[PDB]
Amino acid sequence: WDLVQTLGEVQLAVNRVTEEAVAVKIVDNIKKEICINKMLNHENVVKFYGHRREIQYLFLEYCSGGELFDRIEPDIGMPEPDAQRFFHQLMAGVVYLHGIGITHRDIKPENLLLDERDNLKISDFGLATVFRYNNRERLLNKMCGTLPYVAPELLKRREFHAEPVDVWSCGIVLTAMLAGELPWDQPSDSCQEYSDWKEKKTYLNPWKKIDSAPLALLHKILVENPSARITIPDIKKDRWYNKPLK
Numbered sequence: 001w002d003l004v005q006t007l008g009e010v011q012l013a014v015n016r017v018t019e020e021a022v023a024v025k026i027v028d029n030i031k032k033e034i035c036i037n038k039m040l041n042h043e044n045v046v047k048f049y050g051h052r053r054e055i056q057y058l059f060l061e062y063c064s065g066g067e068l069f070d071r072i073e074p075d076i077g078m079p080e081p082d083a084q085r086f087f088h089q090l091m092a093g094v095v096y097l098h099g100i101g102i103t104h105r106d107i108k109p110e111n112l113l114l115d116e117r118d119n120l121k122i123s124d125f126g127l128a129t130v131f132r133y134n135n136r137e138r139l140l141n142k143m144c145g146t147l148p149y150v151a152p153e154l155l156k157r158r159e160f161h162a163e164p165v166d167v168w169s170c171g172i173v174l175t176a177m178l179a180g181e182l183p184w185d186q187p188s189d190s191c192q193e194y195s196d197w198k199e200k201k202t203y204l205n206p207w208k209k210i211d212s213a214p215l216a217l218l219h220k221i222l223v224e225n226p227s228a229r230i231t232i233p234d235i236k237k238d239r240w241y242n243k244p245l246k
């Protein structure tokens, strides 16, 4: 395997005989990340091939599509139809992860990679952890992620359920896809932008730029009480989510 270039550490590696391409992760967490990656088998999660301990090398499906982040036009987002498709495949990824007791913990556009056909794949399990084992749920105490995408309970609680935090970060991604901007620096009362949302001031950016069907869903996802917040089974039955789009 020869490393043609740096992906953005991750570099593209092309096998000389086969000529097949891939992504190689070189890192000198990692033990957990490798362990969790070898559990995953889904068409919406970056594929794990193997690893070699020379400095550690991880062999991952290469997504020529690049980051979902680059498909978002600033201050504009992207065609509602494309966002819906991406969000559908994102739910598929997370349902799967959650179904095998795994939480990504850092869902964001930088970590949603697109393949040649543009199918979305969830990337980077360096922050991921088990939250269900032997059918026993474990609450999470550690703080992980990025501030704009983090659920508010993560800032306020000593302990919290894993699933609604991932759902919340998926709602922030949906907001970014349809408005081309992040709503708040962090999910806290001190923040003006977050208080404004809690007060339903949707006549402001970013909400101004979102049609009412998807906004109604964001209303159900960006709910401060992680217990009142919509769950993924419910998201599937959401009206916008099942709306035929051009």
Ligand SMILES: c1nc(N2CCOCC2)c2nc[nH]c2n1
Pocket (backbone or CB within 6 Å): 007, 008, 010, 022, 023, 046, 060, 061, 062, 063, 064, 066, 067, 113, 123
């Ligand atoms: C395409 N792009 C990737 N990245 C984008 C740059 O940051 C690292 C992840 C990939 N990471 C693993 N496979 C990949 N295929």
